[PDB]
């Protein structure tokens, strides 16, 4: 429970540096692993994780005075790159304690900064931020993989002004001319990390992770993706859009001109059949593609059963579109006419999945984001209550009918017409009590047509005033995933033409070598930083 | 790229009036046209347009102290 604890750990937490120096000098080890249940990840349990190391506690506890003392104390100094059972160094652990509150975020960045210089002063050659925990994550990847907007916003924009501690800084100013100054961000382990690039950790993450849609608004990420978009992804996406439009044009005609006389599989007799079956072949191939391309997705992005509809609503429909295509082949060689049933759901999904390609366009893609939110939020709530009413009042109605609408389908079908403006208040005379039939339909109409549909309009308006920004940021994330799924798939061998940035020598290795870094230029202006 | 630049233009931008008065008095022209690519309209390029004239820079750079000095300086 407390397994691994020391009285040194006590003193750091009880605000007692007078006794930390007392315990270390008498030989209290400063590598001790508090590998006890209370000292692990909370996960609901009443705990505090800090890093399973004394130095880690002081960093997560805001005594920078203590922290420095641990590292130049003459009796014994903590190993700066010492990690825990999870593999988390102090900087790793210093991320996992972040919670994206300003009082926390101001501190963690203030502290995270200071262990770096200290480790640089102690060890100009050791690289701390490159260290990886047990899982395979860095402090940068951990911040992005865990939702830590302020830490990430710090690490990327890390401009340090010190003689020996600029090789750690990441946001470099190359030149300046009056109010104009031209910054430089680093892109090391952001676009092409061998393991867990920041982009590939923000985008291939789960909606449980907070602030997925806010992290890409951190500079340079936004500018970086719009650079990949403008350079090579936009052309490929429009091309992907064209092929899918030609696909659906072809699957549409091969469907429209389906044989009607016989049972499948049908015969190549005239020339139009040959030029049609072609389209039918090409129709299936896309389904196989979207099938494999969906299996791929739902393996390498092991989907949380709830996250399917939030993060992956479109992928679900392309996959579902594929399934109806494959069922359409199983049933076309199984001689069953029911291939058409499947085939028509593929078309309808197929054409609606054009809205996928709205994400190459801001105002249309934001609109399609609002659509998928309204579906999952406002419409599902609506249709639930609507069907309770529909089924409630239908049963009532069809129980009153005597004799033909003496069926729960037709009555439910007639009562659904009221909500699409096609309700007859006289669709039956076959009953005994007109007062009942009318009171009941009016109650249905008032509750459903006058109230509930118009309430939905009102609910939607509330939603639109709320998800307006959320939907812009879900849009940019949709486009980000396209940029990443693209640059993988398209190149997948060379990975040299999408190199955002360039070799820009920014400074020097603290030993003295040159500091070459792939860096992203950003041009900026100020009118109050006059110095 | 920098075509037309002078060390006088340097001093105005590097917050240095002590050396603007140094350069003008030794005869540094104060009509010089910085008619170089960096000194034209940005139009996407990473530039700063100010007016292609020394006085114009100081006005667009917020040293009114310098600006007045350019116009009653006795040398030119
Ligand atoms: C458009 C952009 C997409 C791509 C181009 C596609 C171009 C479009 C054309 C292509 C071929 C046209 C056939 C010409 C010769 C036969 C004429 C004929 O009898 O037509 C008849 C049927 O015609 C068909 O059924 C043809 C099948 C059309 C499927 C769409 C093309 C598939 C792609 C592969 C093809 C090659 C393309 C590959 C390169 C991309 C016309 O109808 P009807 O006489 O009334 O017949 C009964 C109608 N009923 C069944 C509804 C009751
Ligand atoms: C190409 C193949 C099909 C023909 C094209 C058809 C679609 C049109 C072309 C699409 C691709 C090529 C266009 C590039 C030039 C700009 C277009 C434009 O006017 O953008 C403007 C309007 O926004 C739109 O016009 C976007 C609407 C289409 C999005 C796809 C949705 C479903 C397609 C179903 C189609 C039926 C398919 C079945 C029949 C073919 C501006 O867009 P924005 O919202 O401000 O976003 C920022 C703009 N930016 C990214 C350029 C900076
Ligand atoms: C603001 C938003 C815009 C909305 C509105 C936009 C405009 C749309 C609205 C209105 C304009 C539409 C005009 C069409 C009029 C109907 C057709 C007609 O009258 O007869 C034609 C129908 O027959 C064929 O077309 C031949 C059948 C085989 C080819 C089928 C694919 C068509 C071409 C590719 C399609 C893919 C798409 C295009 C390429 C990628 C000709 O037939 P016919 O000569 O009388 O006799 C021939 C014998 N037959 C009839 C038995 C076959
Ligand atoms: C004379 C005969 C040929 C006639 C003309 C052929 C052209 C026929 C036209 C359309 C159908 C084309 C083939 C099927 C593809 C389905 C559409 C598709 O997946 O588009 C992808 C575009 O990205 C691509 O990579 C598309 C393929 C590029 C090659 C161009 C088509 C020719 C290949 C076929 C060989 C032809 C030879 C014969 C084949 C029997 C979709 O984009 P995505 O990025 O996957 O994103 C959506 C899905 N996701 C969000 C879930 C990820
Ligand atoms: C059959 C009789 C039932 C009625 C008809 C059934 C048809 C379907 C209709 C309604 C059924 C009831 C579902 C409504 C639930 C509330 C909505 C919700 O939480 O949406 C969530 C997103 O949405 C999702 O995460 C997924 C939504 C789709 C799954 C539910 C419908 C289909 C499966 C169910 C089984 C039935 C399927 C058919 C048969 C198996 C969030 O929405 P919100 O919280 O409003 O957003 C505000 C955000 N806030 C919280 C931060 C403020
Ligand atoms: C979305 C639309 C509305 C709901 C649809 C789902 C309900 C499913 C509906 C019907 C039952 C499911 C099918 C079972 C097998 C067939 C029996 C049958 O259809 O009805 C039987 C009667 O039955 C009734 O009158 C009562 C049946 C409904 C009550 C069960 C709860 C439904 C819960 C969910 C409800 C939503 C709850 C609210 C939302 C949360 C037989 O009737 P018939 O065959 O028509 O008889 C004609 C006689 N003739 C041959 C002489 C002409
Ligand atoms: C929000 C919660 C609400 C709770 C809902 C509870 C639901 C209960 C509601 C109503 C039940 C009470 C009325 C019907 C009783 C059963 C049938 C009956 O006896 O009919 C009689 C007829 O009667 C008439 O023809 C006169 C109609 C009187 C009722 C109209 C106002 C009541 C609804 C006010 C609305 C405001 C409600 C409150 C909101 C302000 C006799 O049978 P008959 O054969 O029809 O007689 C011949 C007539 N015929 C020739 C036309 C056929
Ligand atoms: C929030 C909860 C949801 C709401 C629940 C409650 C909802 C209940 C709603 C409405 C109940 C009231 C309407 C009547 C209902 C039928 C009763 C009946 O038998 O009427 C008889 C009419 O008898 C008359 O004397 C005519 C007067 C009624 C005007 C018709 C209502 C207009 C529709 C809107 C009214 C909205 C008022 C409702 C406002 C709440 C019908 O039989 P008949 O044989 O035609 O009789 C006369 C024929 N003759 C003149 C030719 C001789
Ligand atoms: C992923 C998507 C889910 C929905 C869906 O697409 C895929 O799933 C498909 C499965 C199909 C059924 C499969 C088998 C049969 C048996 C057959 O019985 C006569 C057999 C005859 C020769 O054997 C006499 O023996 C009648 C038709 C029926 C019920 C199909 C109907 C359409 C269905 C429901 C399709 C539907 C559109
Ligand atoms: C980004 O792609 C988007 C965004 C928003 C909505 C949609 N499409 C649907 O909801 C389509 C639904 C549907 C339902 C039944 C049938 Cl038969 C066919 C289609 C796609």
UniProtKB/Swiss-Prot annotation, chain A:
Phylogenetic lineage: Eukaryota, Metazoa, Chordata, Craniata, Vertebrata
Location of region: AD: 462-490
Modification after translation: Phosphorylation by CAMKII seems to regulate binding to vanilloids. Phosphorylated and modulated by PRKCE, PRKCM and probably PRKCZ. Dephosphorylation by calcineurin seems to lead to receptor desensitization and phosphorylation by CAMKII recovers activity.
Binding, Na(+) 1: 421
Membrane topology, as annotated: Multi-pass membrane protein
Residues of the full protein shown: 199 to 754 of 839
Keyword annotations: ANK repeat, ATP-binding, Calcium, Calcium channel, Calcium transport, Calmodulin-binding, Cell membrane, Cell projection, Glycoprotein, Ion channel, Ion transport, Membrane, Metal-binding, Nucleotide-binding, Phosphoprotein, Postsynaptic cell membrane, Repeat, Sodium, Synapse, Transmembrane, Transmembrane helix, Transport
Transmembrane annotation, as ranges: 236-257, 275-299, 313-334, 338-358, 362-400, 434-460
Chain positions of motif Selectivity filter: 421-424
Modification type Phosphothreonine: residues: 173, 482
Annotated compartments: Postsynaptic cell membrane; Cell projection, Dendritic spine membrane; Cell membrane
Domain notes: The association domain (AD) is necessary for self-association.
Catalytic reaction equation(s): Ca(2+)(in) = Ca(2+)(out); Mg(2+)(in) = Mg(2+)(out); Na(+)(in) = Na(+)(out); K(+)(in) = K(+)(out)
Organism (species): Homo sapiens (Human)
Entry protein name: Transient receptor potential cation channel subfamily V member 1
Activity control mechanisms: Channel activity is activated via the interaction with PIRT and phosphatidylinositol 4,5-bisphosphate (PIP2). Both PIRT and PIP2 are required to activate channel activity. The channel is sensitized by ATP binding. Repeated stimulation with capsaicin gives rise to progressively smaller responses, due to desensitization. This desensitization is triggered by the influx of calcium ions and is inhibited by elevated ATP levels. Ca(2+) and CALM displace ATP from its binding site and trigger a conformation change that leads to a closed, desensitized channel.
Gene Ontology MF terms: ATP binding; calcium channel activity; calmodulin binding; excitatory extracellular ligand-gated monoatomic ion channel activity; extracellular ligand-gated monoatomic ion channel activity; intracellularly gated calcium channel activity; metal ion binding; phosphatidylinositol binding
Tissue specificity of this protein: Widely expressed at low levels. Expression is elevated in dorsal root ganglia. In skin, expressed in cutaneous sensory nerve fibers, mast cells, epidermal keratinocytes, dermal blood vessels, the inner root sheet and the infundibulum of hair follicles, differentiated sebocytes, sweat gland ducts, and the secretory portion of eccrine sweat glands (at protein level).
Entry annotated with the keyword Transcription regulation: no
Residues that bind ATP: 2-5, 13-14
Cytoplasmic topological domain: 300-312, 359-361
Annotated binding of Na(+) 2, by residue: 421
Subcellular location, principal: membrane
Residues reported in the UniProt entry to bind Ca(2+): 424
Topological domain spans for side Extracellular: 258-274, 335-337, 430-433
Phosphoserine: residues carrying this PTM: 304
């Amino acid at each position: 429970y407390y397994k691994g604890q020391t009285a040194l750990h006590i003193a750091i937490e009880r605000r007692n540096m007078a006794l930390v120096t007392l315990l270390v000098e008498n030989g209290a080890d400063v590598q001790a692993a508090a590998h006890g249940d209370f000292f692990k990840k909370t996960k609901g349990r009443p705990g505090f994780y800090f890093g399973e190391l004394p130095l880690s506690l002081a960093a997560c506890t805001n005594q920078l005075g203590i922290v420095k003392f641990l590292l130049q104390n003459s009796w014994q100094t903590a190993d700066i790159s010492a990690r825990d059972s999870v593999g988390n160094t102090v900087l790793h652990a210093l991320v996992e304690v972040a919670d994206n509150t300003a009082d926390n975020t101001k501190f963690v960045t203030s502290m995270y900064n200071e262990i770096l210089m200290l480790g640089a002063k102690l060890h100009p050659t050791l690289k701390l931020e490159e260290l990886t925990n047990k899982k395979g994550m860095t402090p940068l990847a951990l911040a992005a993989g865990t939702g830590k907007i302020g830490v990430l916003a710090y690490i990327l924009q890390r401009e340090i002004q010190e003689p020996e501690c600029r090789h750690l800084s990441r946001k470099f100013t190359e030149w300046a001319y009056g109010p104009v100054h031209s910054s430089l961000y680093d892109l090391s382990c952001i676009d092409t990390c061998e393991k867990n690039s920041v982009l590939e950790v923000i985008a291939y993450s789960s909606s449980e992770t907070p602030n997925r849609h806010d992290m890409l608004l951190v500079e340079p990420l936004n500018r970086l993706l719009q650079d990949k978009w403008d350079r090579f992804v936009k052309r490929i996406f429009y091309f992907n859009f064209l092929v899918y439009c030609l696909y659906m044009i072809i699957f549409t005609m091969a469907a429209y001109y389906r044989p009607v006389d016989g049972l499948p599989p049908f015969k190549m007799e005239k020339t139009g059949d040959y030029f049609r079956v072609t389209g039918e072949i090409l129709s299936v191939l896309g389904g196989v593609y979207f099938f494999f391309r969906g299996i791929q997705y739902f393996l390498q992005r092991r989907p949380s059963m709830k996250t399917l509809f939030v993060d992956s609503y479109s992928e679900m429909l392309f996959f579902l579109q594929s399934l109806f295509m494959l069922a359409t082949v199983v049933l076309y060689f199984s001689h069953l006419k029911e291939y058409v049933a499947s085939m028509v759901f593929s078309l309808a999904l197929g054409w609606t999945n054009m809205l996928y390609y709205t994400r190459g366009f801001q105002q249309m893609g934001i609109y399609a984001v609002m659509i998928e939110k309204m579906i999952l939020r406002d419409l599902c709530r609506f249709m639930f209550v609507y069907i309770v009413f529909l089924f409630g009042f239908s049963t009532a109605v069809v129980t009153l009918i005597e004799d033909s609408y003496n069926s729960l389908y037709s009555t439910c079908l007639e009562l659904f017409k009221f909500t699409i403006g096609m309700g007859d208040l006289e669709f039956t005379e076959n009953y005994d009590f007109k007062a009942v039939f009318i009171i009941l339909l009016l109650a249905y109409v008032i509750l459903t047509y006058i109230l509930l549909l118009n309430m939905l309009i009102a609910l939607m308006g509330e939603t639109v005033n709320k998800i307006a920004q959320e939907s812009k940021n879900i849009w940019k994330l949709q486009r980000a995933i396209t940029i990443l799924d693209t640059e993988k798939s398209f190149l997948k061998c060379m990975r040299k033409a999408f190199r955002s940035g360039k070799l820009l020598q920014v400074g020097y290795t603290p030993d003295g070598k040159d500091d070459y870094r792939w860096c992203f230029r950003v041009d900026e202006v100020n009118w109050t930083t006059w110095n």
